[PDB]
Symmetry: C4
Subunit: 388 residues, 4 copies
């Protein structure tokens, strides 16, 4: 009924508790589970749901062959109930396309899907489950967006798009939507040199996005957005605890205003919570592949170029596959503070498990606790041999 406002700060993060897990690849071995990738989580005022890009086939279906490809006419943003698997019978299609974001502004949901050939893509912006605005490609090279939820404040929902090269300068724009209409857009500013796949959260009337510099950086770019002024800035996480993948080994000193070098032309969607001493970074455990997942408390990671971990939690062991990770919060929970949450995509099949013809994923998701909770690890759990 009223637009949500980001009026709280982050709760104190002392560990992470289990929130949701769908076991999709395990279940889908013998039931009608859609092939997906690029999942995330997003809340409405009365319900939190899982989101992902469907590949328009089941896992056991013969059409799962070739689902390593990212962009086809058979993809769609779907959502489904928390910790269920994305099945043919319980998945709701939000919009058609192969890159997406979605967020609820307190009154209703905006969802954005991009589709088209590489040189001629377009975003359709849906609001209250109707298409309202369309944006054509501006650089004719894979118009793409967050692949995790956007955040709204007083009806204003900023969204980061990038169009242009994955391996060289690109054109990044921040659109400021309200009711699916464009209030304003800006070209990227500040010192981030390449932006993809922003993972975002809102607190005290500011939106923080941790992104992927695909071109040069193994540290992550950060965009900080003021949704009232509709202005933003960008920099990198200063910390030497480097959080992209693949990446070089951690140094002793990071970079604040440039890419930390050592790996070019590659990366993974990731996230952080940047809140002074209450700062936690996610990363794959492996420097070489999307294997393992950990949370590291790195006080002042954003601003301190020598900051190292003071605490940590294993999410996925290094002998298990991970993938994309991103941020969401239940903005509508009761209580004095916003509880940080994240999900990790657990990718299975190709390219690393190539005895199957498909690529898919399941989801694990955690939220922060002010307790110091015991840790477990949360693998996908499927036996690929079963699919042979």
């Amino acid at each position: 009924r009223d637009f949500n406002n980001l009026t709280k700060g982050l709760c104190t993060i002392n560990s992470w508790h289990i929130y949701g897990k769908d076991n999709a690849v395990r279940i889908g071995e013998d039931s009608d589970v859609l092939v997906t990738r690029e999942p995330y989580v997003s809340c409405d005022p009365d319900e939190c749901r899982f989101y992902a890009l469907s590949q328009g086939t089941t896992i056991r279906g013969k059409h799962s062959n070739g689902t390593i490809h990212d962009r086809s006419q058979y993809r769609a943003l779907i959502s489904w109930p928390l910790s269920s698997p994305p099945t043919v019978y319980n998945s709701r299609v939000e919009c058609i396309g192969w890159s997406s974001t979605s967020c609820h502004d307190g009154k209703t949901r905006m969802s954005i899907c991009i589709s088209g050939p590489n040189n001629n893509a377009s975003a359709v912006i849906w609001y209250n489950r109707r298409p309202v605005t369309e944006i054509n490609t501006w650089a004719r090279n894979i118009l793409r967006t967050q692949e995790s939820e956007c955040v709204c404040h007083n009806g204003v929902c900023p969204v980061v798009f990038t169009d242009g090269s994955a391996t060289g300068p690109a054109e990044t724009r921040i659109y400021y939507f309200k009711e699916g209409k464009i209030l304003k857009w800006e070209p990227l500013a500040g010192t981030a040199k390449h932006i993809e796949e922003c993972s975002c959260y809102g607190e005290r009337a500011e939106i923080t996005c941790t992104c992927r510099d695909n071109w040069q950086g193994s540290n992550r770019p950060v965009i900080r957005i003021d949704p009232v002024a509709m202005t933003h800035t960008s920099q990198y996480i200063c910390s030497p605890v480097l959080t992209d993948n693949p990446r070089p080994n951690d140094p002793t000193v990071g970079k604040c205003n440039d890419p930390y070098p050592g790996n070019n032309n590659n990366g993974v969607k990731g996230f952080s919570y940047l809140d002074g001493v209450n700062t936690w970074l996610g990363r794959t455990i492996s420097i070489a592949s999307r294997s393992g997942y950990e949370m590291l408390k790195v006080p002042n990671a954003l601003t301190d170029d020598k900051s190292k971990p003071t605490q940590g939690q294993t999410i996925v062991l290094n002998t298990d596959w991970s993938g994309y990770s991103g941020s969401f919060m239940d903005y509508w929970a009761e209580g004095e503070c916003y509880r940080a949450c994240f999900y990790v995509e657990l990718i299975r099949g190709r390219p690393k498990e190539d005895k199957v013809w498909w690529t898919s994923n399941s989801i694990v998701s955690m939220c922060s606790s002010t307790e110091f909770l015991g840790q477990w690890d949360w693998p996908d759990g499927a036996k690929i041999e079963y699919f042979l």
Copy 2:
């Protein structure tokens, strides 16, 4: 709560954006997807849904053998959520029969199914999901209707029926319903010589239907209906851009008040938006079979017998199957104008793909954008070899 009134004009159509796609044949290769044909789309005030005639069997079921036949006791109008596939578990049966139409008047939904042997068919008119009126065959030769949504204005929902020959003069009637009760009916008037399968839209208190002349015309007949006076007229699209299928090659000058000759006794359901310079026509790309699909901006197509395209958009490549197409709009969207939409049925299996015993379809649907958006093509996406 109030009856809807057609109080807006059409938005400016500068391209088409993707709206819905169900990927049904791909998904149904390995999940419980009903065999269908004759699909369409229709909105309620709070939801838009996919509609089709079920064949009362799944695609992988052995009973899909023989589903090339149009009329059986196993067919029913079903609806299901936008861009989901029509599954056994998520499909709602509207009514029983093998020819249908459906539309929401602002307060509730009217659905019409016709069933029976060829010589003794009957329409049952359902309103608020209860049968209210029944109409017996008047020419004892396949009583049949639109196979796409009707349109209502102030409670009045006109519906075009035809009973009689597919290959010679037939008896076409326009019924004017309100709350499922017949207010009036008229025999066809004006210069259209044969009418089937009207695709209709409403704007500024008038309903425009683009139909199929199965007997003689490769140009399409048009019925224009005044739902307040409850009167109508008919003519043909004047344009030489001919839009039935199969059809002769395009001439330089069309016919306004007679069938454009060259193909007899055949056709496909299609549609147009006829709005002065804002006029767009759909057609299969092939003149010979239901292959490919394009949208052509043909200013004044209705009234100008020399009008040629000034713009276009590919929907389905000519190396992919199409099928029926039709019109719908979300009459309940907020905004100053009605956004034109359409769907294309993508038919698979028999008669052209005859290594399978079944015939089915998936759906793609688009709405108009006031942007000039990049184009993609939208095939069914299924590999028939997988079903062998």
Copy 3:
């Protein structure tokens, strides 16, 4: 919100239009459809649904072997949306048992299931989806009830039960429920000599039930109930158009107050609408087995022992299986009169189709039209060979 009152008479019945058909055995050949029998239809104020006794297994499941048996611990009254099939995923369990009835009183639904061994059965009466009353067997020989909907008037819902022999005198009782509580019960009165499986309808504050005399009668017993006085009487349909099965050939004169002889110890659930000249009887076409189904207009069938048909309609051809049939009406439809409806169970598998190990059914249902509509036939449609 208010209790429904039977304030209307029957509409004029001039033919029957198709209402619902689930095609369950066809669909269930390759999807998760529950094995059922003893189906019926019943309306709530906002929805009409299909009802049946599940056998607690799918048709393709190995546990369908043996489902020819009527009474097991694996049976339950289920309901599901009109013209859908009873699937594992869309069926709601009303109550547990192997004999049932159900009806909505205008405020909420009463459902009754009987379970137990033959000598120790009990009815549980559910109201607003909670168990409220229980009734123990009184004759220790298969306590059993209607297998089709009950009818309510001002909160009073009479229900006919029989306990005792199927082939000799039994103890039949009429319970008068309100909010699931017993207001009163009576032993059977009038001249009916054996009662099973009453099919009931309500009009002008009276409830009429057409039942099965299993012991001696090939004419059907009738119970007429006054739900305000909570009293009833019974007789037989006088007409020589005999409507049980199996049955002797039709004579020229029937019996009003005794069983019409010729077949002993056998029968089928059936129904009629007894309304002076507006009287229609259902019967299987075959005198020998549950094959075919027709509706016959037999003016004054109840009271005229020489009355013969003046009109008719084929529902199921004599080369197709039928089964149980029963009455229901949408008491909540708008309009000046109650539209008569019925369903026919289309039984497949054992005992007549014994190359399969299972017995199941699909449903067809019709309502009356004041038009003279063309007729079709409505078989189950499944090919048993597909299940071999």
Copy 4:
């Protein structure tokens, strides 16, 4: 809208009537039914549902191999509609973990799942389907809880947890929750020597729990809780009718304040209704394995150490498998008293049926009748040979 208060006493229990049965293993032989164990039943004000711990795989899925294990990352508390099976498509995930409880306080539902390795487990307390409180392991040895519903009074919902050895003294705590927040907790008091898996019910402002002494007792410990004072006590059922499993033969005199010896280090979740002369105890019929299930009326079982049965009812024959059993009541039923209900888990597969690689269960549930109803037996009904 208001918190529920335990203002009624128990109805008179004169027998048990059938309430719910899901036939899950039968149905799941050929449909997408999740593998489960540790089921229970719990009501909301408008709906009663089945609950269990999923194993994150279907029964026919290859991942069912190994589901004899109790604790994995693939488990979750799920709920589903009464007497449906827990399917992939109709199951709602309450929370992630391998030990649980859940109860509705009149305004909304609290659910609690525990997850983690054996030495580092944690409880997450969800309220209104959001995580609110987390509790870390205190004895670093499988933190575990009830595995059946909790009970609330005026917003206060006590919950029994145990952390520590299964075969020696452990640390049991009673947490008093309100809106998912901890109001208070107490260490176990009174004379019970070991507590696991409390089955609880509420009447006249007191909560009674019948638990499992795994270490020494074949009589059951009882905890009685005052949810207004937030205090409790504990003792054993005095009766010589011993109700754990496995167990020695029944003696003539029981123990009130110590474990009845004869079996060490083993047991089964069970329940009783302790209400003076209106006292009923459940037990497996076999003393040696989880086979058979009966209800025994044992007047004053709680307080009389020589009390023997005066009445009984067979629930499951001794030639059929049983398992866990527990208590629930519909606190929101209308009427002068609370109707006692219980469920029995019918375990199938390993360890006793070891030709299959999986372990799963179905559910049967009964409520009390003030009639003396005939008895049936209620086995799972599945043929294990079908799964070979």
